[PDB]
Amino acid sequence: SPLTDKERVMIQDSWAKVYENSDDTGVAILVRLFVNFPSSRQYFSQFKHIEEPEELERSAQLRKHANRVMNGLNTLVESLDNSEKVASVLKLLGKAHALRHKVEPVYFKILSGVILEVLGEAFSEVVTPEVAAAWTKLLATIYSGINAVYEEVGWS
Ligand code: HEM
């Protein structure tokens, strides 16, 4: 809940390295999500029934979404010091996924999980225990605001 100025800097600085290899990382994340937590695949018409990473990484639909996810995060990171703006971003997100896509909010949580897991595996020389703790705080914030919108919207 309390995010510090140093942590904020930890995040901006690590993210700059992650964004440099943005695309592969996006999909590495989504492939772990969809493989490890398969029911999460249910919302995606073109690969809901695909189990294999090599199959999944070739899905045009997977990849576009993986791209959208990362741009999302990037926006959230560019915007860390402006809290009204993170609020609207999470609002927009949460609405769409609630109303248009009908995604169970649990998957946002599980995704936050996977992002750490993959960040601090693909980019371990940067994601130190300390940096990981900051990303934790951030992603709990993301997930918390998403849930808040989901309730505003009528999901209980
Ligand atoms: C930080 C997390 C995420 C971000 C930034 C994100 C962003 C987006 C964006 C920008 C779109 C397209 C624009 C829109 O329709 O609103 C989209 C579509 C979608 N998202 Fe996400 N999303 C995220 C997480 C999730 C998660 C966890 C799921 C879980 C299954 C999911 C499922 C979908 C689906 C089903 C669509 C429709 C895409 C399609 O037509 O194939 N998203 N997302």
In short:
It is classed as oxygen binding. The chain is mostly helical and 156 residues long.
**Rg estimate, integer Å:** 15 Å
- Which CATH class is shown? Mainly Alpha
Large-scale geometry:
globular
Main pleated sheet: none
- Would you tell me which CATH topology applies? Globin-like
PDB class: oxygen binding
Keywords: cytoglobin, cold-adaptation, NO dioxygenase
Assembly: monomeric
Entry title: Antarctic fish cytoglobin 1 from D.mawsoni
Reconstruct the topology from this structure.
Layout: H1 5-20, H2 22-36, H3 53-57, H4 60-78, H5 83-99, H6 106-122, H7 129-153
Helix pairs in contact: 1-4, 1-7, 2-4, 2-6, 5-7, 6-7
Describe the 3D structure.
The chain is built from 7 helices and no strands. It has helices spanning 5-20, 22-36, 53-57, 60-78, 83-99, 106-122, 129-153. Helix 1 (5-20) runs antiparallel to helix 4. The relative contact order is 0.16. Residues 40, 43-44, 61, 65, 68-69, 72, 93, 96-97, 100-101, 103, 107-108, 111 line the site of protoporphyrin IX containing FE. It comes from Dissostichus mawsoni. InterPro entries: Globin (IPR000971), Globin-like_sf (IPR009050), Globin/Proto (IPR012292), Globin_lamprey/hagfish (IPR013314). GO terms for molecular function: heme binding; iron ion binding; oxygen binding; oxygen carrier activity; superoxide dismutase activity.
Q: What key phrases describe this protein's structure?
A:
Globin-like; cytoglobin; oxygen binding; mainly alpha; 7 helices; cold-adaptation; monomer; binds protoporphyrin IX containing FE
